[PDB]
Design a protein around this nucleic acid. Structure first.
Ligand SMILES: O=P(O)(O)O[C@H]1[C@@H](OP(=O)(O)O)[C@@H](OP(=O)(O)O)[C@@H](OP(=O)(O)O)[C@@H](OP(=O)(O)O)[C@@H]1OP(=O)(O)O
Lengths: 169, 834, 129, 106
RNA sequence: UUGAAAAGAACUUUGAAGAGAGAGUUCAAGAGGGCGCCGCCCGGAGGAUUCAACCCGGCGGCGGG
RNA sequence: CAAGUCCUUCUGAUCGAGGCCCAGCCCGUGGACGGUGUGAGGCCGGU
RNA sequence: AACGCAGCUAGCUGCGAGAAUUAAUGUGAAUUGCAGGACACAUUGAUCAUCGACACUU
């Protein structure tokens, strides 16, 4: 499942991120993300109502910077991996991202050893390495600045909007 | 005077920009003049400066002196108000702010801070009046209108809140911007208020006017779908929901909307609804799982066959998880079991799902996944041997798959072997140590296996350097690990550490609710008012999470044990030890004890000195303490926390959020019953019994409650007759008015098929009649296959109930029951023969 | 220790060139450090000051958290002027206070054609190392 | 090749305490020497006496107080800094064995 | 060679002014424009890791053809 | 074309005084010098 | 060596009727005591430095 994060659930990726990713934080920018961009955070829920996946994204606040998004965190449990849950989360988050902000691209940061997410981002989501920033994390291991252009899928999103508006009339 | 006034302005300037020391230095020369030595406002500002420097008592004294020097000075009262708010003493802060307003009625800062407070402690009337005054004072500010609308919204009075919204939006119709995200948020909030009022027609008409002014198309479409469902425009709702389906095929809400819009008369049409969904979009696992929730018979057979075929060809992990819901009905269990067995046999014979299939030969990984499914199925059904042999075969075939392990964990933990599972997934974490999912779940198992030190050590592989794993995890408010640590500490009877963990949970919950204070000034600037109000309704229901429930129940069982039998013997053995001890030799041993205790005191003083300084160097280098001033929480002192003066009272504070929020669960009322029973609260006994009766009148522990209450009321004679009349009416209604023995007997025959019910009935047979212990012994130890919910979990709970003395001394009967359960459950360690 | 025979370490010589320096040279000593956020993003430590940059004072009586913009780069007196760095003259007017560029932090740069080229030239020298 | 390993080295030989003493003894010269380029004065530290130059000078030359001396060319001005004998010296294995050939035995 | 920075003394008052008196700036005008009874013993009333001698371990000094 | 304007504290301002998991803040093939409201390897030019 | 050249300019300094500088190149937002003048800074330019073109009164 993929749906918007109603801050009833902002506590659930707080549960999940500690369980999965070492890049962990408190809950404060969790409210900051949820309140600033309630429509950008999406989650995955099982038949038992427990969170099994999530995406944490945020708008850049630099005015000089071109409109582009950044994902703060994105992970999937081993029980539900290789289902494309991260992929579909990224697609829907980027769709809402373009509809509400018209971003040109999206940036992120990726662990060097997390080779599975590297496969996902490169082969599956066609993301590309922008820059390498060493010692970004607390353990000192290097990270890739990962980016994918969002103009191309925004094009067919506009096409679908035009095809639906012609149908409505 | 003008010069001192200018210096005063520099002082506060320094304060607002956090130059505390410059402010105190500047006020020093102000207080140098004897004519201003007693000057109230400067002393108040100085004290309010030192409060941010940590000296709370000096700040208190100086601020009260400044206040009493000039009560008319609203500045001093405002200073005291920030002083109280600085240490979360909000209730005094409101009073100080109102006292300040009596001198300066039109101070914007005081009124806005008071409004932030009034929303902090939910003073809807006071916040509404404050926002009305602000709106009168500053109508040009959009914050005034926003807050005034907020105040009425929290009142659920959506009519005048709505007209405030439309007026304010007209003020936002000044057209200084394009389709603004904040403007879209305001429109969506106004639509939310309209739809919460039930004014669906005008809400839909208004939203139908501002689609071009809303960037959030998802909210527009979902609101259109629900409103058209409410307005009986079924076709329009169907079109909107199918647009949402093309937008997000993975959300059950859109399938629900399609079902309600189309209104399928029968199951065939309902299936045809998803047929188009998965023909237009075969990829994914959504349109095909939903039919299996309602399909039955041969159609369910073929759809399930297709589902298992595509899942096994894909070979994805969570296939078992999604069909776990279909185990409720045993016909689906038999269908899936025969299907997977046939698949395994066909793959073994000719490497196909069906030998008649025209497709290409399936890979052996498909057979491996089928064996994995079989192992999980037999684990859930209750056949540990078959699941174990299947998982052994799968592991032998593919030893590199980490998922085959966790199935073995499930098998062992459901069979009663937690240590073997913990060791095996220590191996599994050794297979993949980079993933913290396996690390965290591993720590969870040896927390369940009481290897708390081992769990702490291996979590340190990912904890931030410079701190212990326990301190770090307490710092991130690690909820599940803390709760499991508390349960483990309970396992070795360490009540102090478990209560420390539970109070850590309580402190964290207090920490969440004060976080909204900073956000009081954020979203109003961001006009994300929907997120505002829904976040606000979050904290008022914040403690409804099951994590709080498990922490509170751990704490409350600890307190119940420490009140019903509050370990009354604390130091009596030491007194009795010296009774036969000669005075001279008593002096000998007490002198040696004095030597040892004073040497150990010197020892802990010197050793803690280097570690406190080392951790000081750590924390200052962490920059968390290198810039940190406030009120430090007092040490929990787990040893002292164990010897809690008022155990029931602490547990009562714990259920207070349960008693305000978590009323759905019967355990809240049962816990209140237990506490107030140890508080001889019969008047609370009856009401707790009533609340628990309204939820699950057939609960075993609740039947224990009714029985115990009836017996205690019968034996007690100190109750007043006026109370007695109403109470007698209450049992004459709720109870059968018969003797407790016959009531328990009637319950036991009514629930003779459920093992916990029989155990409780036997316990109260023993309690109501200790001479009747033997019949209860036989009643509790039955293990007939006709007994419902007689699983191994009930087996060990019955075993420890027999051991705890709830049925008296039954060591031979407990041993016989243990041996019989071991025959039933060979892998259960709690039934391992002596 | 300096090993270049053609570069002097003499006190009087070094002072003379610093006090008697052409304006285009003086711009180079008119350098200020970027904040951590620019430094991480541009991979540049220090930049020459310009007429319109968001500048924060970190030393002196006017040290604080507020952000201001340069309004004048007085290269003759080796000082710059921000808006709120003012003091009260006797008669009643308000005059700017000269702050040395080395005692401030650039919080936002005057992003410009020549400027944009300047950062990437310095930044691309970092990946060389 | 790097100063970090050089600092770590003599930290293992427990000679780092002298470097801190040199660091502590860093002050302004008194008199007209400030006007004449002799502005800073400090105590002289241990001598490192080597045989072959494979980067030894570049690793150590940045550490205050350290003096590098070639075993083939000794300097009395650096072995007795103020004319007083007894400066702390650290030898390399190759340089140490060359003393018999350089100055002979009895 | 004022002062970190002119922040180079607003304004009030006497004098025709030069000159003052208040006031103000500055950390500084004392920088105002050629200005830098204690050791042992006796007695009493008290308290306490306690004494010697033994046992274990460690470390030194001296001696061994 | 490297690295502290980190924290606490002295001052009118400080480059001053303490501290900086790992035997030891960070760089050091860079601890020359000068400037910057004392006295600065790590603020700046440089080296 | 003399005499002239600055918006306000006596000396010092620089310059030569193109007279506190022209052109060109590098650099890249100032000069400054005041005012004015500037300043898309590439549909290319203040200041400074360099200096190979031009000019250089008796
Ligand atoms: O049905 P059960 O046999 O009682 O197992 C469940 C399951 O345990 P696992 O974590 O081992 O799978 C839950 O986890 P999920 O299946 O949802 O992942 C877990 O809750 P968590 O999700 O928080 O782990 C829950 O725990 P509890 O009974 O305390 O509610 C409980 O496992 P346990 O009975 O072993 O605790």
């Amino acid at each position: 499942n993929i749906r918007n994060a109603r801050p009833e659930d902002l506590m659930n990726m707080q549960h999940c991120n500690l369980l999965c990713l070492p890049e962990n934080y408190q809950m404060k920018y969790y409210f900051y993300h949820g309140l600033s961009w309630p429509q950008l955070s999406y989650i995955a829920e099982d038949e038992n109502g427990k969170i099994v996946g999530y995406v944490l994204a945020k708008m850049e606040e630099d005015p000089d910077d071109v409109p582009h998004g950044h994902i703060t965190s994105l992970a999937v449990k081993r029980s539900h991996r290789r289902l494309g849950l991260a992929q579909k989360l990224m697609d829907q988050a980027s769709r809402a991202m373009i509809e509400n902000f018209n971003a040109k691209y999206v940036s992120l940061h990726v662990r060097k050893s997390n080779r599975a997410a590297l496969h996902l981002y490169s082969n599956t989501l066609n993301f590309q390495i922008s820059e390498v920033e060493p010692k970004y994390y607390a353990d000192g291991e290097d990270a890739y600045a990962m980016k994918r252009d969002l103009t191309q899928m925004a094009d067919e999103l506009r096409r679908h909007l035009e095809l639906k508006e012609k149908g409505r009339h | 005077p003008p010069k001192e006034n200018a210096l005063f302005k520099r002082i506060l300037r320094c304060y607002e920009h956090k130059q505390y020391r410059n402010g105190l230095k500047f006020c020093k020369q102000i207080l140098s003049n004897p004519k201003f030595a007693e000057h109230g406002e400067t002393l108040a500002m100085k004290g309010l400066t030192l409060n941010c420097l940590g000296k709370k008592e000096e700040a208190y004294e100086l601020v009260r002196r400044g206040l009493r020097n000039d009560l008319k000075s609203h500045v001093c009262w405002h200073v005291y108000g920030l002083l109280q708010r600085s240490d979360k003493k909000y209730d005094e802060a409101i009073k100080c702010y109102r006292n300040a307003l009596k001198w300066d009625k039109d101070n914007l800062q005081i009124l806005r801070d008071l409004s932030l407070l009034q929303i902090q402690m939910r003073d809807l009337e006071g916040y509404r009046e404050t926002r009305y005054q602000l709106l009168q004072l500053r109508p040009a500010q959009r914050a005034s209108w926003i807050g005034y609308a907020i105040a009425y919204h929290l009142l659920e009075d959506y009519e005048m809140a709505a007209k405030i919204l439309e007026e304010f939006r007209k003020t936002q119709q000044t057209s200084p911007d394009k389709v603004d995200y904040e403007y879209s948020e305001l429109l969506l909030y106004q639509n939310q208020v309209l739809r919460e009022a039930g004014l669906y027609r005008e809400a839909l008409e208004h939203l139908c006017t501002y689609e071009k002014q809303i960037c959030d198309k998802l909210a527009v479409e979902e609101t259109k779908g629900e409103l058209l469902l409410q307005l009986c425009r079924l076709e329009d709702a169907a079109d909107v929901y199918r647009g949402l389906q093309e937008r997000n095929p993975e959300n059950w809400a859109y399938y629900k909307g399609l079902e309600k819009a189309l209104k399928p008369a029968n199951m065939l049409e309902r299936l045809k609804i998803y047929e188009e969904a998965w023909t237009k979009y075969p990829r994914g696992l959504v349109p095909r799982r939903l039919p299996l929730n309602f399909l039955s018979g041969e159609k369910f057979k073929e759809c399930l066959d297709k589902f298992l075929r595509m899942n096994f060809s894909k070979g994805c992990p969570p296939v078992f998880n999604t069909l776990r819901s279909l185990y409720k009905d045993k016909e689906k269990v038999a269908i899936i079991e025969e299907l997977v067995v046939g698949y395994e046999t066909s793959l073994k014979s000719c490497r196909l799902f069906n030998p008649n299939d025209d497709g290409k030969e399936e890979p052996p990984t498909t057979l491996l996944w089928v064996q994995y499914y079989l192992a999980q199925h037999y684990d859930k059904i209750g056949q540990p041997s078959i699941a174990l042999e299947y998982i052994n075969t799968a592991i032998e075939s593919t030893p590199t798959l980490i998922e085959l392990f966790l199935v073995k964990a499930k098998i062992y933990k459901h069979a009663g072997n937690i240590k073997e599972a913990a060791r095996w997934m220590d191996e599994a974490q050794a297979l993949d140590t980079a993933d913290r999912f396996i690390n965290s779940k591993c720590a969870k198992y040896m927390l369940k296996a009481n290897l708390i030190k081992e769990a702490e050590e291996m979590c340190s592989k990912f904890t931030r350097e410079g701190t212990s794993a326990v301190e770090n995890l307490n710092e991130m408010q690690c909820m599940w690990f803390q709760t499991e640590c508390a349960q483990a500490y309970k396992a070795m009877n360490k009540f102090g550490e478990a209560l420390k963990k539970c109070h850590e949970i309580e402190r964290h919950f207090i920490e969440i609710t004060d976080d909204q204070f900073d956000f009081h000034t954020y979203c109003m600037r961001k006009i994300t008012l929907r997120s505002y109000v829904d976040l606000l309704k979050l904290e008022d229901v914040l403690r409804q999470h099951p994590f709080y429930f498990k922490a509170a129940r751990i704490a409350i069982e600890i307190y119940l044990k420490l009140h019903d039998n509050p370990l009354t013997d604390e130091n009596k053995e030491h007194e009795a030890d010296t009774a036969n001890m000669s005075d001279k030799e008593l002096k000998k041993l007490r002198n040696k004890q004095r030597r040892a205790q004073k040497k150990a005191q010197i020892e802990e003083e010197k050793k803690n000195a280097e570690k406190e300084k080392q951790q000081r160097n750590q924390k200052k280098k962490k920059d968390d303490d290198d810039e940190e001033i406030g009120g430090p929480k007092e040490e929990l002192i787990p040893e002292k926390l164990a010897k809690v003066e008022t155990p029931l009272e602490e547990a009562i504070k714990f259920l207070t959020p349960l008693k305000n929020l978590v009323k759905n669960k019967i355990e809240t009322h049962l816990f209140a019953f237990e506490i107030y029973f140890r508080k001889e609260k019969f008047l609370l006994m009856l009401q707790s019994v009533k609340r628990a009766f309204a939820i699950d009148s057939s609960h075993p522990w609740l039947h224990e409650c009714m029985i115990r209450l009836f017996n205690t009321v019968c034996e007690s004679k100190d109750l007043s007759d006026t109370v007695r009349t109403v109470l007698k009416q209450e049992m004459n209604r709720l109870f059968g008015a018969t003797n407790p023995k016959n009531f328990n007997e009637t319950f036991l025959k009514r629930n003779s098929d459920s093992l916990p019910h029989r155990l409780s009935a036997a316990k109260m047979v023993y309690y109501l009649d200790p001479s009747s212990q033997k019949r209860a012994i036989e009643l509790a130890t039955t293990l007939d296959e006709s007994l419902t919910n007689r699983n191994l979990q009930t087996c060990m709970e019955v075993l420890e109930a027999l051991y705890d003395g709830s049925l008296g001394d039954c060591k031979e009967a407990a041993e016989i029951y243990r041996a019989n359960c071991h025959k039933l459950f060979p892998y259960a360690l709690a039934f391992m023969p002596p | 220790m300096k090993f270049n025979p053609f570069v002097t370490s003499d006190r009087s010589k070094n002072r003379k060139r610093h006090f008697n320096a052409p304006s285009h040279i003086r711009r180079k000593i008119m350098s200020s450090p970027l904040s951590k956020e620019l430094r991480q993003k541009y991979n540049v430590r220090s930049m020459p000051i310009r007429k319109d940059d968001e500048v924060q004072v970190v030393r002196g009586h006017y040290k604080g958290q507020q952000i201001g913009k340069v309004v004048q780069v007085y290269r003759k007196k080796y000082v710059i002027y921000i808006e709120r760095v003012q003091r009260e003259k006797a008669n009643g007017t308000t005059v700017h206070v000269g702050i040395h560029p080395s005692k401030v932090v650039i919080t936002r740069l005057k992003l410009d054609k020549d400027r944009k080229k300047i950062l990437e030239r310095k930044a691309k020298s970092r990946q060389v190392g | 090749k790097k100063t970090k390993e050089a600092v770590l080295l003599l930290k293992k030989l427990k000679a780092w305490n002298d470097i801190k003493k040199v660091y502590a003894s860093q002050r302004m010269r008194a008199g007209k020497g400030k006007m004449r380029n002799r502005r800073r004065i400090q105590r002289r530290g241990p001598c490192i006496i080597y045989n072959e130059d494979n980067g030894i000078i570049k690793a150590f030359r940045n550490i205050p107080g350290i003096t590098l001396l070639n075993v083939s060319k000794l300097n009395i001005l650096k072995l007795a800094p103020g004319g007083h004998v007894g400066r702390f010296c650290i030898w390399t294995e190759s340089a140490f064995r060359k003393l018999d050939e350089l100055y002979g035995t009895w």
